[PDB]
Structure formats: structure tokens, C-alpha cells
Design a protein around this ligand. Structure first.
Ligand SMILES: NC(=O)c1ccc[n+]([C@@H]2O[C@H](COP(=O)([O-])OP(=O)(O)OC[C@H]3O[C@@H](n4cnc5c(N)ncnc54)[C@H](OP(=O)(O)O)[C@@H]3O)[C@@H](O)[C@H]2O)c1
Ligand SMILES: NC(=O)c1ccc[n+]([C@@H]2O[C@H](COP(=O)([O-])OP(=O)(O)OC[C@H]3O[C@@H](n4cnc5c(N)ncnc54)[C@H](OP(=O)(O)O)[C@@H]3O)[C@@H](O)[C@H]2O)c1
Ligand SMILES: NC(=O)c1ccc[n+]([C@@H]2O[C@H](COP(=O)([O-])OP(=O)(O)OC[C@H]3O[C@@H](n4cnc5c(N)ncnc54)[C@H](OP(=O)(O)O)[C@@H]3O)[C@@H](O)[C@H]2O)c1
Ligand SMILES: NC(=O)c1ccc[n+]([C@@H]2O[C@H](COP(=O)([O-])OP(=O)(O)OC[C@H]3O[C@@H](n4cnc5c(N)ncnc54)[C@H](OP(=O)(O)O)[C@@H]3O)[C@@H](O)[C@H]2O)c1
Lengths: 58, 58, 58, 58
């Protein structure tokens, strides 16, 4: 049922920028489908976002 | 092979405090076993930490 | 011109919760008036938010 | 008494990478001299670090 899979390249659609690979997943009531995304510009740094904030790119 | 499972109650072992439930997982080279943890004090806010930073509590 | 000062007790108005003291300030084009807020529940952990996301409480 | 000033270009010295401009400052007991740093690769996204984690670059 997941929109993205591990290793998909994604970016934030709007506001603060972020772009890199899906490295993980999380689930809360506020964010029932969320992803961890490792920056492709800053190796090692990871941010987490709701699926609606992200879009996949090639 | 995972140290924690969804819904385990964990806290940060040292430095900045954080305590709540495991809600997710992530994997990078720097942090090959990491977890997302939703605060039990601040619903909705989630932080992510390496497994070595966390310990399970009852 | 600042809405809050160091040591004000604030909380997030909506979405993910956060509550504690103002401990700092930041300025970007996206967020020209932002604050660092140390949780009163999780000492040491700090999050940063735009002024519009926060409200002062006693 | 501050190590960096607004607009200094800094990077994380080790572990997860981060590089961009100083955009802010924070103070806690754990981190009595901390900085907010806006990524030069991902405009708008800001992370916060203790002074010991950062070094200035030209
Ligand atoms: N995503 C991560 O994992 C992560 C980790 C470390 C740092 N950060 C930092 O967080 C920032 C993300 O910036 P952004 O543009 O996505 O969001 P932002 O402008 O920093 O807004 C922060 C959050 O505050 C709330 N908010 C913002 N404006 C609001 C308003 N007018 N009214 C009510 N609430 C408002 C929303 O919080 P709610 O979500 O509570 O609605 C929003 O997600 C970056 O600087 C980033 O590096 C993110
Ligand atoms: N974990 C999250 O998801 C998350 C999200 C938003 C905000 N935060 C904020 O981050 C903070 C976590 O504080 P903390 O006590 O865990 O860490 P901290 O004292 O803020 O240190 C931050 C990071 O900088 C590096 N660092 C710190 N001291 C260093 C030193 N002497 N030399 C070299 N590097 C050093 C380490 O980075 P490296 O990891 O690169 O080694 C450390 O993990 C809290 O204020 C928290 O709310 C965390
Ligand atoms: N604030 C910090 O310093 C910090 C540090 C570490 C971790 N975090 C974590 O970030 C979370 C904050 O949650 P929250 O409720 O404030 O925000 P959220 O629901 O996690 O949303 C994250 C950000 O993604 C964007 N977004 C969310 N929904 C969107 C949508 N439908 N369309 C387009 N963009 C959308 C906004 O980003 P933009 O801001 O780019 O618009 C929003 O600020 C907590 O889990 C928190 O612990 C925050
Ligand atoms: N800095 C921010 O503003 C911010 C915002 C959002 C997301 N993040 C995310 O946080 C990450 C930073 O990674 P990093 O390499 O600096 O740190 P990290 O490897 O993610 O470690 C996280 C924190 O947990 C503690 N820790 C890590 N290893 C430990 C160990 N072996 N024993 C005890 N505690 C340990 C330290 O926390 P203590 O600090 O409590 O000692 C460390 O600062 C990135 O993925 C980044 O994008 C940071």
C-alpha cells in the first residue's frame, strides 16, 4: 500500500527543500504514512516527512 | 534481527532526553539500524536516533 | 521587534505538539522570525519553529 | 564571545554532513553555545548544532 519504497529518489514539494533517497518509514496518528529521506547533498543527515510533502523524481 | 519493535517504549540513554514509542525505522551507512520515536509527552512530534542511543523501558 | 524573548514559555499551536522555553532565534527567507524552543518535558532536546507556529502560555 | 556570526559558512566536522550559513543561535545547559545553520544545498531547511560540532570554511 506504500507510495515509495527504499531507495526511491524523492524531494520535498514545497517550503524548505530536501532531496535524496528513501531510507525508512514511520507511522503516527498525525502522519499515518511518513518517510525518512537521507539527503543526497549531505550524506548521513536524514529528515522525516509525511508522504504528502514528498514527490518521487528520477 | 531488530532490537525494537513498533510500540516499544524507549528513551534516549544520555544527552538530550526523548521518551515515547517506536513508530518507525531507518537505515543508512552511518546509522544502519535507526528508529523513529514519537514523544509520549508531545503527541505527533517524532525524532530519529541510532539504536545505540536508545534503551527500552517498561 | 521580536514576538518572544528568551525564557518565554511557548507551545506549538497545532499539529505536532511541543512546549517549553525559548532558548534561541533564527532568520531565513522562508522563516524570517523563527525560534528555538527547549522542551520542558525532554530536557536538552530543542526544536525550531516559525513564530506563526508558536504561542506564549503562562 | 561567539565563535561564529550570522552569515559565516560552516560545516559539520564529522558524522552526518551539513554545510551552509549561520542563521541563528541557541543556548541550553547541554549546549550553552549552539547555532542554527541553513543548508546551502537545500534552501529553507535549517539544522541546529553545538559549536563543537561545527567548523567555519571559506
Ligand atoms: N523534517 C525533519 O525531520 C526535520 C528535522 C530537523 C529539522 N527540521 C527542520 O524543519 C524545517 C522544515 O521547514 P518547513 O518549511 O517544512 O516547515 P517550517 O516553515 O519550519 O514550519 C514548521 C512546522 O511548524 C508548523 N507551522 C509552520 N507555519 C505555520 C503556521 N503558519 N501556522 C501553524 N503552524 C505552522 C507546521 O508544524 P506542524 O507540522 O506541527 O503543523 C510546520 O510543519 C527545516 O528548517 C528543517 O531542516 C526538520
Ligand atoms: N534526532 C532527531 O530526530 C532530531 C530532530 C530535530 C531536532 N533534533 C535536536 O537535536 C538535539 C539532539 O541533541 P543531542 O544531545 O542528541 O546531540 P547534540 O548535543 O545536539 O549534538 C548534535 C550532533 O552534533 C555532533 N556533535 C555534538 N557534539 C560534538 C562534538 N563535541 N564533536 C563532534 N560532533 C559533535 C553529533 O553529530 P553527529 O551525529 O553528526 O556526530 C551530535 O549527534 C536535540 O536538541 C533535538 O531535539 C533532533
Ligand atoms: N521543528 C524541528 O526543529 C524538528 C526537529 C526534528 C524533528 N522534527 C519533527 O518534525 C515534525 C513536525 O511535525 P508537524 O506536524 O509540525 O509537521 P509534519 O506533519 O511533520 O509536516 C512536515 C513538513 O512537511 C511539509 N508538509 C506537511 N504536510 C504537507 C502537505 N500536505 N503538503 C505540503 N507540505 C506538507 C511542511 O513542510 P514545509 O515546512 O517544507 O512546508 C511541514 O512543515 C515532528 O514529528 C518533529 O519532532 C522537527
Ligand atoms: N541537528 C538538527 O537540527 C537535526 C534536525 C532534524 C534531524 N536531524 C538529524 O539527526 C541526524 C544527525 O546525525 P549525527 O551523526 O549528528 O548523530 P546520530 O548518529 O543521528 O546520533 C544522534 C544522537 O543520538 C546520540 N547518540 C548517537 N550515537 C550514540 C551512542 N553510541 N551512544 C549514546 N548516544 C548516541 C547522540 O545524541 P545526544 O545528542 O543526545 O548525545 C547523537 O547526537 C541527521 O540524520 C539529521 O538530519 C538533526
Amino acid at each position: 500500500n506504500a507510495t515509495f519504497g527504499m531507495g526511491d529518489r524523492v524531494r520535498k514539494k514545497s517550503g524548505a527543500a530536501w532531496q535524496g533517497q528513501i531510507v525508512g518509514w514511520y507511522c503516527t496518528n498525525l502522519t499515518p504514512e511518513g518517510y525518512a529521506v537521507e539527503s543526497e547533498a549531505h550524506p548521513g543527515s536524514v529528515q522525516i516527512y509525511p508522504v504528502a510533502a514528498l514527490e518521487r523524481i528520477n
